Subunit: 324 residues, 4 copies
């Protein structure tokens, strides 16, 4: 998985979901008066409305990532082997990992409010069902000022980090992931100087040689570096159409192509989908692996005061434009 906030003019937040199998995701809008039930907290009977990609299990939205009507966004990305969910604490809001996105996006409008709410939270070891055991996740949270932060629940407790580069992938823990970027200071959009020796003729035989050491791999660290390079060198435009086009080139640059990340016999982790929300306008965009026409769901064209889930199918089939 890869998640970014991209702030050329308006602010766009979203992620690639990298898994080996698709099973029942939809675009889900949760309106303000849908009651969020919590295992160990009183229900949120009214809350901010939100939109994202989710499973719908027994009428409950298990969000992979979402954005609320105040321009606050949040995404849960795989964090295998690192994620720890804790015992219940008598002095904290005990919130399950699968309840984390509704808890936060339903109650908070800014990063500062997120931090305040997190000062009272305990991400607790609670499973949705015996069938659906909890996934191992860490979270990227960003708001429409362009500020972002990272939440990791490690063995020695929960850690919260300001995110100066506004990107997140998977393992390792954010301090190591962020520091690894320092090793790529010389990766450049421009041709290199001959620093090797002026007594040797270095021929600039290919445009693009500046990025010769850009990681191309499917792994977590390679995608973090690659998405950071793409994000901070992408062009800035004035229109919505241009900036969302650029946004999807950023995420598609770290797409996991089928066959390249093999996790088992004929089993391949790949980018199921790419989404992005205009945090300033509440507009949800997505592409899928097989359908890279941009699909648009406008949260503001729904009745956000209603009390039941609003669902749209993810258009995940190849759609061709036949010019005859």
């Amino acid at each position: 998985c890869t998640s970014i906030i991209f702030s050329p003019k308006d602010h766009y937040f979203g992620r690639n979901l990298d898994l080996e199998i698709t099973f029942g995701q939809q675009v889900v809008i949760t309106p303000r008066n849908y009651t969020f039930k919590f295992r160990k907290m009183p229900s949120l009977k009214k809350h901010y409305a939100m939109i994202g990609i989710s499973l719908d299990m027994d009428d409950y939205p298990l969000y992979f990532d979402a954005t609320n009507e105040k321009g606050l966004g949040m995404a849960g990305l795989n964090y295998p082997g690192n994620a720890t969910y804790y015992e219940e604490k008598e002095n904290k809001d005990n919130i399950a990992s699968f309840e984390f996105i509704p808890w936060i996006l339903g109650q908070c409008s800014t990063i500062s409010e997120v931090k305040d709410l997190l000062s009272r939270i305990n991400i607790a070891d609670l499973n949705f069902s015996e069938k659906m055991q909890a996934s191992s996740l860490h979270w990227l949270i960003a708001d429409k000022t362009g500020t972002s932060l990272v939440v990791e629940t490690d063995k020695d407790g929960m850690h919260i980090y300001d995110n100066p580069v506004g990107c997140l992938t998977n393992n390792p823990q954010f301090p190591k992931q962020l520091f690894n970027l320092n090793n790529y200071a010389d990766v450049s959009p421009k041709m290199p100087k001959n620093n090797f020796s002026d007594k040797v003729n270095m021929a600039g035989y290919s445009r693009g040689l500046g990025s010769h050491n850009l990681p191309g791999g499917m792994d977590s660290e390679s995608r973090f570096v690659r998405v950071a390079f793409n994000k901070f060198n992408a062009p800035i435009a004035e229109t919505e159409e241009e900036n969302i086009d650029t946004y999807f080139h950023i995420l598609h640059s770290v797409e996991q192509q089928k066959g390249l990340d093999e996790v088992g016999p004929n089993s391949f982790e790949y980018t199921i989908y790419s989404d992005g929300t205009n945090l300033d306008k509440g507009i949800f965009y997505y592409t899928t692996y097989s359908n890279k026409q941009i699909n648009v769901v406008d949260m503001n064209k729904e009745d956000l005061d209603s009390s039941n889930l609003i669902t749209y199918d993810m258009l995940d089939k190849t759609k061709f434009n036949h010019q005859n």
Copy 2:
């Protein structure tokens, strides 16, 4: 530029066109009875029909790449500084670089016929006009057996190479480009073995670590290695829709994103378009940088006995699908 042949069941040939500035291009079917004129050879009054993308002129089809009705495909890719075109030779067929595709694709059906014609050819230093100086190219040729061939006109003469990997980018010369692949034997879709030492605990901390050393750069050798890894590990499917989807994932895996390959002040080489032809069926497909919905032009739906160029606009503007 990157060009491949991809042979899952049917055979698909095409390329990314990477340039820092466009002047327009278009899809062009040249029918059988469009007379091909040649500066130094008699005209081909009748020939095979072909389809590809050319410059936005209707004087003459100046193809970037094309595929004829017999399943033979050919693409010219930037070869900066290496490409040498020769003085006219009395005992050869003197053919301009911009006449190469019509000359070959107009008369040849197989790689074997291509080689016979190439043995008597001389790629002459002729310009389409005094203003339109010939660009520096080398060529990938492939037919529907999956066999392919590289043509390079260097300063010491024309060299013709069998291509065992069916890929081509830009510099250097093909023996160096092909040999460089030997350095990436251990790049893997599966998790790496701990070869370092069984006394060191190596944590397989991220899926995709097998490809940690896959090159991600925008440069010529990086894209050659990366597209070969993508092509030979791409899944094999049974439907046309699935295999052409896969084909565009291979080409998009070596797309040059705007901003990442700087050739001058605010001037960036980027992937203008990606195209692919089903050599077996005569069906032409393309995406462009800003419109990655796949566009289809079926050559067999046209009057191939016509005498006039048949043209279609390249739809290069972002197409959104609004769902609510």
Copy 3:
């Protein structure tokens, strides 16, 4: 800087010193009854003898690294910008960075005893003098069982790490440095399998292609990975001569060559020297940049009950052997 413990049979501990300027340093044995004086603690009037390379100033051994007579070793490696030394603390033993090696090596014989002393230490922001401001260092400590730990004094306090690979270089902090090794699991002494695709003919055109992605750089992470690869694939022998021979190949594999690491105009960081001590025997070995004949100083041939520093020159000029004479 690069420091290792190498444990083929006996145990060998030491380091490359990577700096841009030398002058002053000697092989220095501090005997049992040389009185170690401390700015904020009572003097150690008698203590374990030790041997190492030191800058002697005002009759005080400013050790770069040393090993004591009980087979405990300790080295201070550059930690630029990372090292933080603290205000004096009540309820702690306040010890200056330049007194750290005498404090530990004078009093401890084992890692377990080192850990006891560290639980009550505080590395204080104290300078040798106005002209000698304290260096930014972190420390590798190893004993003759082959166990080692790392001490790093960061902005948010002192951290002590068990060291499973027995190697240290410079920045970054040890958890990041140790975790970076995970990126090199596929580096191999053996020819690589063709994982790329069995549809592509990968020619095995050179021996050694298994190590094609081994880092060769002069930088701290590169050297950490390269020294670990060298150490864990080095052969093990049953002889002192062979095992110390191997030891210096490990250290020399990560030598910084003059001209390859420029830290300012006409100023280059390079490996001044490599040393190694046999912890089980008390034998100090070293080479220098211009003299890679192994020089030997046996601490046990000196009077370890004396009270004065005992010094030997670092033989740092090239000594050619004319076979033709």
Copy 4:
């Protein structure tokens, strides 16, 4: 194997010999009136004196590398699978690959003289003895002007190349080996500039980060790049002691450590010795894997008009200096 000419003031030519088995080589001075016998040419009864490392096979010097009294040096380096030796030719001096060094260094004093002799040569497929096949080699040749050239005998003929970097290792052919240097222009002794993006704070956390991408491997291409970086950034001094010290630091920077290049079960290729000769002065220097004190043999202190080989044992055992 790695071979260089290093030209700080005087000129130093030599090599690392990288093999898995030591045989029993020694330092051999061949005086002017030792008769060189050839299988298919008249004997060379008087010739230039030379010094180098040789096997000894009943009175015949089989040099790995040598340098003659006129300052011409030559080294045979493994070229596995690539070396082709030819059928005898009726119009050429047919010289065995193991006769090549005596043939050249016996009669030539300069690179230009070498090039004239090579115009009449045919490196023929002659083995030294029934159960000792010829080894597969290519050669680096250099003289006291600093100039060097490469001789490679490939399937399609002998190829001679001027060597602009004065370096050679093993496979592949020299054109590909040399061109690969272009991929390392940015490898630097100096700290890198932040070209990734100035919106990203890149910490220059370690001295030497400029060489972060210097290859460290044991393989042929890695050592070629690494010895070149070491050679052209090595300091230049006024005296012999200083320059020969620098010279061995260059060769030792590409030493293959035991255990790092496994060629078979419990069998490793390693640097058996490093040697260099002062071309201007005829002084021979060497280290061995286990003895890094520089050993010196002055060819000119011997009787160069003699008729018998003059042999010295290689001091290959560790010799310690006990200071107390």
